[PDB]
Design a protein around this ligand. Structure first.
Ligand SMILES: Nc1ncnc2c1ncn2[C@@H]1O[C@H](COP(=O)(O)OP(=O)(O)NP(=O)(O)O)[C@@H](O)[C@H]1O
Ligand SMILES: [Cl-]
Ligand code: NA
Length: 607
């Protein structure tokens, strides 16, 4: 069972015998089928047996001094007083220092046993919870029902997939006369001047508390429970929120799994179905040509190159367009959204990625898929994107959907109507405590190696899977040379970073390094580090750089809530970040000039 390729051999350096005879004894020992078979009984397969033997022979041949007990046995084997198999217990103890996993396999199994996840949440197990799955398309009112139920409860928590949604529900709750706190990875707002927690809170799903009683919880986008990297946060909220009613919102493809899980907790599931609030239809004609653009059009693109090329093509036609993509800061996304939505603003076309699928209220008359390749978009993605046309909360009473090119149109019709398979399993991840206990057993393993050994030893029930830890392992490998305690290193490797931006990676090293030296990262120090003041961008690469500085400031903020004394200046950094969002916001308003500079001065080819 255990994958022995994951074991990185530790070095055991060398500390009267005939060394030529001993070698002969060693070489025969290695070759005895009996000895190899006894090796395998103890977990030494061919590779471990081999690697332990190489170092064992090495240690014996090169040590100036052996322990007395092994010395005597070698003397006695050489001189006929002992059988050669008597060397085996020494070889085994040697192997166990080369490969300490061989000394604690049962222990590691127990530590990484992830079966019966609900037992991890004794507070939720200790009370009745009823699960209500509000199932339906986007724009069906499934979310509105859950959220109103939340607004009317004496206490409640909303858990969303996106920071923008946590903000939005926090703003709506307070505007509706319901005191509501905000908890995201980067921000905590306590609205009550008494500093006490409000009885409603709006959070990103990873930040929800599983030890706080609530009358009502809402878990938005429940199907993200199968997300390969993030699904674990949805499993944790679904199994662990101590709410009398747990309201779920999402697609019907998540229902069967939810029922399998809630069967294991003995909790009732009530499904409530919703239909689209307004009409929607797919057209018989492609857009075919950008000449055919009309106010309220949204062209959805699957690469940033298409975003640039399309927004510039639109400009050269004498039209303005708004731009939305995932890595924009949130004040920019909102400012672009507001220009596009304002009927009296002549900017009336939106060029956006699939980031518009959730978290922004957009008044879109017609979705035009620019292409259908991201590999083709999935039925779920298409339906989420499509359904953004004609939202009940917009002035468009009906929605339209089409593609740009005519060949794509029946492919789109086909994708949209194709049945979606039930999702099959819920994500789990190793906790900080589990990895810290692994590290006590295997204190010389690197953290990225411990994660792989944990995953390999772990056991899960049929309805779960262990989430991907590639991001976490990339950070671990980046900071592996910095001295940090296990629990601190774990937190640093969980900070969410875009590993494709060198300045973000350089910043994580810098923050980890200063932490390790007890050197607080102050506002003044950070301001010089990012070379403030930063200037308006002149081209796309300048914009990308600003966005990368904005993410570094997010990294500082994320860390400040885990390490307050070493990142003590969060308010001041937030202020600086808001000035940087303003600069990026003006640059994005002017994005067609940045793009024109990139193409015409930098000669970048956008297609
Ligand atoms: N009864 C109602 N009165 C006023 N507005 C409503 C009502 N029902 C729904 N809405 C609005 O119509 C839009 C769609 O509702 P709903 O489908 O519950 O939300 P949604 O934003 O599409 N969910 P998502 O797919 O997660 O973005 C939202 O702006 C709602 O706040
Ligand atoms: Cl490490
Ligand atoms: Na524009």
């Amino acid at each position: 069972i255990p994958n022995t390729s994951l074991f990185v051999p530790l070095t055991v350096k060398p500390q009267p015998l005939d060394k030529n005879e001993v070698k002969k004894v060693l070489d025969k020992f290695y070759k005895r089928k009996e000895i190899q078979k006894l090796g395998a009984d103890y977990g030494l397969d061919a590779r471990l047996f081999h690697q332990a033997f190489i170092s064992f022979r090495n240690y014996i041949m090169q040590s100036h001094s052996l322990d007395v007990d092994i010395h005597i046995v070698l003397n006695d084997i050489c001189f006929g007083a002992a059988h050669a198999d008597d060397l085996f217990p020494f070889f085994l103890r040697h192997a166990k220092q080369i490969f300490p996993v061989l000394d604690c396999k049962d222990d590691l199994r127990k530590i990484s046993d992830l079966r019966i996840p609900p037992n991890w949440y004794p507070d939720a197990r200790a009370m009745q919870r009823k699960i209500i799955f509000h199932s339906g398309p986007t724009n069906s009112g499934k979310t509105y029902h859950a959220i109103q139920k939340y607004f009317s409860a004496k206490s409640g928590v909303y858990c969303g997939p996106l920071k923008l949604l946590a903000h939005e529900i926090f703003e709506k709750s307070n505007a509706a006369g319901v005191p509501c706190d905000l908890v995201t990875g980067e921000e905590r707002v306590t609205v009550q001047p008494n500093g006490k927690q409000a009885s409603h809170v709006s959070c990103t799903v990873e930040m929800c508390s599983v030890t706080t009683p609530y009358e009502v919880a809402v878990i938005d986008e429940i199907q993200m429970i199968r997300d390969p990297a993030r699904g674990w946060a949805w499993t944790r909220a679904l199994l662990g929120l101590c709410a009398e009613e747990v309201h779920l919102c999402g697609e019907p493809a998540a229902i069967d799994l939810v029922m399998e899980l809630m069967y294991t907790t003995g909790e009732e599931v009530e499904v409530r179905d919703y239909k689209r609030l307004t009409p929607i239809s797919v057209l018989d004609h492609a857009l075919e040509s950008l000449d055919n653009l009309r106010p309220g059009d949204c062209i959805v693109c699957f690469s940033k190159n298409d975003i640039y090329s399309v927004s510039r093509q639109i400009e050269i036609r004498g039209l303005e367009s708004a731009v939305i993509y995932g890595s924009l800061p949130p004040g920019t996304k909102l400012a672009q959204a507001k220009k596009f939505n304002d009927p009296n603003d002549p900017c009336k076309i939106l060029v956006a990625t699939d980031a518009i699928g959730m978290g922004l209220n957009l008044s879109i008359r017609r979705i035009i898929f620019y292409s259908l390749i991201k590999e083709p978009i999935t039925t779920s993605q298409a339906l989420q994107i499509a359904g953004r046309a004609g939202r009940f909360s917009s002035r468009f009473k009906e929605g339209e959907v089409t593609t740009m090119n005519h060949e794509d149109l029946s492919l789109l019709k086909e994708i949209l109507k194709r049945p979606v398979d039930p999702i099959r399993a819920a994500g789990l991840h190793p906790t900080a405590e589990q990895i810290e206990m692994f590290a006590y057993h295997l204190p010389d393993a690197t953290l990225s190696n411990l994660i792989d050994i944990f995953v390999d030893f772990s056991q899960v029930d049929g309805q779960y899977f262990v989430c991907n830890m590639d991001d976490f392992k990339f950070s671990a490998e980046l900071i592996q040379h910095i001295p940090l305690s296990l629990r601190v290193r774990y937190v640093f490797c969980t900070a969410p970073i875009n590993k494709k931006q060198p300045f973000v990676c350089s910043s994580l090293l810098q923050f980890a390094r200063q932490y390790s030296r007890n050197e607080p990262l102050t506002f003044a120090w950070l301001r010089r580090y990012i070379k403030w003041p930063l200037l308006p961008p002149k081209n796309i690469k300048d914009l990308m750089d600003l966005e990368a500085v904005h993410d570094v400031l997010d990294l500082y903020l994320w860390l400040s809530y885990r390490f307050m004394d070493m990142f003590p200046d969060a308010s001041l950094i937030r202020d600086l970040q808001k000035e940087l969002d303003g600069i990026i916001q003006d640059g994005v308003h002017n994005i067609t000039k940045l793009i024109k500079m990139s193409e015409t001065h930098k000669l970048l080819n956008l297609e």
